[PDB]
Design a protein around this ligand. Structure first.
Ligand SMILES: [Mg+2]
Ligand SMILES: [Mg+2]
Ligand SMILES: [Mg+2]
Ligand SMILES: [Mg+2]
Ligand SMILES: [Mg+2]
Ligand SMILES: [Mg+2]
Ligand SMILES: [Mg+2]
Ligand SMILES: [Mg+2]
Ligand SMILES: [Mg+2]
Ligand SMILES: [Mg+2]
Ligand SMILES: [Mg+2]
Ligand SMILES: [Mg+2]
Ligand SMILES: [Mg+2]
Ligand SMILES: [Mg+2]
Ligand SMILES: [Mg+2]
Ligand SMILES: [Mg+2]
Ligand SMILES: [Mg+2]
Ligand SMILES: [Mg+2]
Ligand SMILES: [Mg+2]
Lengths: 246, 99, 120, 109
RNA sequence: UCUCUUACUUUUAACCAGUGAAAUUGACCUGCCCGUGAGGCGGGCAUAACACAGCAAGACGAGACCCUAUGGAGCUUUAAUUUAUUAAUGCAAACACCUGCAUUAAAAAUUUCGGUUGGGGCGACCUCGGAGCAGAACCCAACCUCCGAGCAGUACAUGCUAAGACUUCACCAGUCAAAGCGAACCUCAAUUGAUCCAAUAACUUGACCAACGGAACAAGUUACCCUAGGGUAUCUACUUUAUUCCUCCCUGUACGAAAGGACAAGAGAAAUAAGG
RNA sequence: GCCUGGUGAUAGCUGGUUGUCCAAGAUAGAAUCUUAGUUCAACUUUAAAUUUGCCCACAGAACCAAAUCCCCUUGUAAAUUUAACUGUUAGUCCAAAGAGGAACAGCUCUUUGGACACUAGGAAAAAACCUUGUAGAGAGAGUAAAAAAUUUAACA
RNA sequence: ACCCCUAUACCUUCUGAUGAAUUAACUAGAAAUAACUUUGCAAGGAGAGCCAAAGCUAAGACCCCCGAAACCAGACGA
């Protein structure tokens, strides 16, 4: 401890105290770097290098739709709904050398990543998930042990409705009548001839979307999955059906 | 602590004890101590103080002959450094060169 | 203030009297110095302590060979009060690889390359 | 009754002595009055500080001082001099190291 | 009481017998003189060992005085902050008391009383710059020596950006700046103030916060102060080592020349000290 | 008042901090209701990465003494950066340059360098003067510093 | 055995007075953010939550004792 002072006695002052002059961490103006930090939305990146990597090693099956559950179960992307991740964003890294016909549902996507998927005969759409809904999507099995009926996912807030209703970034609430113009525009911009998805055999697979207010793929809101004896209990009351099919 | 600092003083006090005994024994033959030690070095007799003190006590004829060799060398030092210039060196004054 | 001392150049210019005193020739001078520390670096400034460490004279009464070039002479001029300098004279040649082990530097300043322990 | 005088040292003087390589914009020397003047490839700030305008090596010289004709102080100091009297000052130069670019082959059209 | 003390009795004492504490205590085989910085260190000197009784020169042992604490407590206020408490008013509520909200008083309550200082106080000061100290890269103190500053003036591209640097010995702050875009075709040394908070639609603005790295707002005093700190003898040593005044004589001679005027030695009488 | 509790009150202040052995290791400062203290720096320590560090030669650094900066060679072996932290600071004295004071002080304040807070020898004793450093045993040897020197006055 | 020679008690506080008669027993370094070392697994680690542009998991390894005047609440006391 050294010689007898205040640091030997055990009573050195708090961290940051500069002995009486105004401390470093207080001489400096407050600025809002971290002002609304816990309400900003976060999106884990998934590069196309990463997703080609998952498709090559059998971890993500591209002959099925790639929802967010399939990226979690292949352990391609770890997303945590606390710490307010709102899902995955596709990332243009590895756009050259991306050779996969795929159907991904990713909450944000850059133009060049949409171009790299849609070049190869792919489909991208950008869905939205509530924190509740996203949390049920990522780890679905600890939700079906919770006993609750499947809820309906909520529509975006007003900041994000102009995002998911645009056909340029492939919104899930946008027209399916404005999509060929946008696919045609990217195909003209980045110099590839736009293949028609209608011709090949995976088309019925490459067309499937779940509508808004549907969290899982083949299921519906209001159903109660009985994991134990492998059943699905469905409600038949009219008030519940007005509430769940809203 | 005294026990370890006394190693230095053991060596020191033995040496002054030997110089006292060589001094006494060489004063018996008229020499002084600096004369004896100097003019035995100058004869290439490199005996040390312990041995000279022990010869002084136990072998006083060898010690008398060493005092005779040292006083003879001392006089050749005198006579050599008196008649200066090129001359024959002293008999006991000669050195044995080692190569 | 106590400072580092420059020494003028007239101090290091020999006179023919000095060539009569010591054994030197101004033409054909000696190549190697023998330097020995004969005084302590304690109570001396830190720069002299350093120069003693550079010249390799940390132990006293131990000879060290140096070159007689102006750089080494500059360092020697800084600590010339702590050392002793003599010319390395070589009566026989510098030692070949045959005579490399059997040498001895004598007190005179000469380095003999055949060191028996027999009398002549 | 002597208050004041507690000001510290300005830490001025030469930052780059002669021979030193210098990049563009390095402050060569800060002075309080013109001890050194800007020579070739050396600029001056509002604080009379000499900085460098090219990359090269700093050199100090002694040159003839001929002030600007609109500088009535130094010009009035000139005309009082006798007929041989010529003022000198010490200047600082940066001798530029690099060439300012090379021609390189780009395409065989 | 004293000159100046003396005698005796009792007690105490000392010895013998019984009983039997305490403060104290680094270890001690515990000398003197000088010197150093003194039982112990240096130079000298001294020196068989051991009780018992004394003495009190030394060894070893509270009460003051000053300063300090971002330590307390008390007292006085025109220190600061309150009015919770009372007492009055006023207004509401209600049809004087009571309740609510203000306001003025008394009674108090809470908290404080910065720093520098050849111990402290008075005085003076507390930040920034120039010069000397500090002669020649940088830096360098003092209740050291001398000057100053807390602005003014001009311009409104005193626009925006940006390589590279300097930097008051940290940090914070400070400075310089090419190229570029846009245009034309700052002087001075210092000339100053963080954060939070306010004011403002915004751009911006806000302290002699001068104790000048600034606590959002707190005085005097205490010899009543208080606390924490800083400046009955154990040992050594010791306990039986003839002056002066006056008188007288020599002599009122010596000496001087008159005035003057001896010594010495002797007798006296005193006084003190020493020993009886 | 006194007792119990809050209460292990608080104390930048005093006092105290328990096996062994080795190693590396001491003196710029800036702020502060601050000078009995802390924070940053400087110095110190370990680990790591790398590449230079130290000594230095010419040349060079302003007008109104001693030296220093800069610096290739050379002699050496360190330095910087990265990571992680503690601790230390009114130092004292001597030599030198000065300031205040009485050209007093074991007085006060700066600067440069030593030494001391690290060993041993010497100087009477002896922190700081001189010699000397790196650790053990030896009944060997060579050395270093190292001992104060003085004695007087006739006159033509 | 002593005599000879050498040798200014220990702690602590200062750049260089304090406390201790003596013995026995009792009596004072408590935290794993980050870094480091060692494993595991590794674009993933972790037995949910958390981190991840070689990381993550686990462990090891760092933070004292005594001492006021006081203040407040409730009792007990003439
Ligand atoms: Mg010896
Ligand atoms: Mg000044
Ligand atoms: Mg200053
Ligand atoms: Mg009795
Ligand atoms: Mg004395
Ligand atoms: Mg004593
Ligand atoms: Mg007695
Ligand atoms: Mg307090
Ligand atoms: Mg700096
Ligand atoms: Mg202040
Ligand atoms: Mg201040
Ligand atoms: Mg405590
Ligand atoms: Mg405190
Ligand atoms: Mg060591
Ligand atoms: Mg303050
Ligand atoms: Mg303090
Ligand atoms: Mg260089
Ligand atoms: Mg101890
Ligand atoms: Mg009663």
């Amino acid at each position: 401890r050294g010689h007898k002072g205040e640091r030997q006695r055990g009573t050195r002052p708090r961290l940051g105290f500069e002995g009486g002059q105004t401390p470093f961490y207080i001489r400096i103006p407050k600025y809002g770097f971290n002002e609304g930090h816990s309400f900003r939305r976060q999106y884990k990146p998934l590069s196309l290098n990463r997703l080609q990597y998952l498709i090559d090693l059998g971890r993500v099956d591209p002959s099925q739709p790639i929802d967010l559950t399939q990226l979690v179960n292949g352990r391609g992307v770890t997303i945590q709904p606390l710490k307010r991740d709102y899902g995955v964003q596709l990332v243009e890294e590895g756009a050259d050398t991306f050779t996969a016909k795929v159907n991904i549902e990713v909450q944000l996507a850059s133009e060049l990543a949409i171009a790299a998927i849609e070049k190869n005969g792919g489909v991208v759409t950008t869905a939205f998930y509530d924190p509740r809904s996203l949390d049920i999507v990522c780890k679905p099995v600890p939700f079906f042990l919770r006993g609750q009926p499947i809820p309906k996912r909520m529509l975006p807030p007003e900041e994000l409705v102009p995002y998911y209703t645009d056909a340029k970034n492939r919104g899930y609430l946008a027209d399916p009548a404005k999509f060929p113009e946008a696919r045609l525009e990217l195909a003209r911009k980045y110099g590839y001839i736009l293949p028609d998805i209608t011709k090949d055999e995976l088309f019925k697979m490459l067309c499937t979307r779940k509508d808004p207010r549907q969290i899982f793929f083949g299921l519906a809101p209001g159903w109660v999955v009985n994991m134990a004896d492998k059943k699905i209990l469905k409600p038949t009351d009219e008030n519940l059906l007005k509430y769940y099919t809203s | 602590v005294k026990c370890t600092k006394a190693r230095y003083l053991k060596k020191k006090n033995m040496r002054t004890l030997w110089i006292n005994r060589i001094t006494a024994a060489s004063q018996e033959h008229g020499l002084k101590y600096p004369a004896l030690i100097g003019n035995l070095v100058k004869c290439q007799v490199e005996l040390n103080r312990k041995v000279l003190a022990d010869l002084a006590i136990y072998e006083p004829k060898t010690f008398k002959s060493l005092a005779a060799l040292a006083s003879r060398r001392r006089h050749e030092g005198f006579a050599a450094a008196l008649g200066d210039g090129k001359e024959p060196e002293g008999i006991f004054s000669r050195v044995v060169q080692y190569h | 203030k106590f400072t580092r001392s420059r020494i003028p150049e007239k101090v290091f210019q020999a006179s023919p009297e000095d060539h009569e005193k010591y054994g030197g020739d101004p033409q054909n001078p000696h190549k190697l110095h023998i330097v020995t520390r004969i005084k302590s670096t304690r109570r001396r400034p830190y720069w002299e302590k350093d120069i003693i460490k550079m010249l390799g004279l940390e132990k006293a009464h131990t000879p060290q060979v140096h070159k007689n070039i102006p750089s080494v002479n500059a360092k020697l001029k800084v600590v010339k009060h702590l050392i002793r300098i003599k010319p390395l004279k070589l009566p026989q040649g510098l030692p070949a690889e045959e005579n490399m082990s059997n040498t001895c530097l004598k007190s005179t300043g000469e380095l003999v390359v055949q060191w028996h322990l027999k009398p002549v | 009754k002597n208050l004041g005088g507690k000001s510290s040292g300005r830490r001025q003087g030469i930052k780059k002595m002669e021979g030193h390589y210098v990049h563009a914009g390095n402050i060569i020397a800060t002075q309080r009055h013109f001890r050194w003047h800007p020579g070739a490839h050396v600029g001056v700030g509002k604080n009379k500080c000499l900085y460098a305008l090219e990359e090269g090596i700093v050199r100090y010289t002694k040159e003839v001082y001929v002030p600007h004709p609109r500088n009535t102080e130094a010009v009035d100091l000139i005309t009082r001099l006798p007929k041989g009297a010529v003022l000198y000052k010490t200047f600082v130069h940066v001798v530029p190291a690099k060439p300012e670019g090379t021609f390189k082959l780009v395409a065989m059209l």
